[PDB]
Symmetry: C2
Subunit: 48 residues, 2 copies
């Protein structure tokens, strides 16, 4: 019982941690895209 | 030891699930913010 519980819990925890890290990276990339789009689009504003 | 491992890993699994769901929701809302901001600055294009 202990061995099976340890194995399945470890697998679930590792997968969930990987998913959380991926979600954090995606959010950071979205924020960077926000900044880049705002800057470039304001530059186009000024150019036009 | 099996019981203590079970408790710790159940807490970890619950926290990881909640964090994953919250981060996915935050990423989706961030993308919605991206779309809304892009629309707002396009509208500023036509208005200005």
């Amino acid at each position: 019982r202990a061995d099976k519980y340890k194995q399945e819990t470890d697998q679930l925890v590792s997968n969930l941690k990987e998913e959380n890290t991926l979600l954090k990276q995606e959010k950071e990339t979205l924020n960077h895209r926000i900044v880049e789009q705002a800057k470039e689009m304001t530059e186009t504003m000024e150019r036009k």
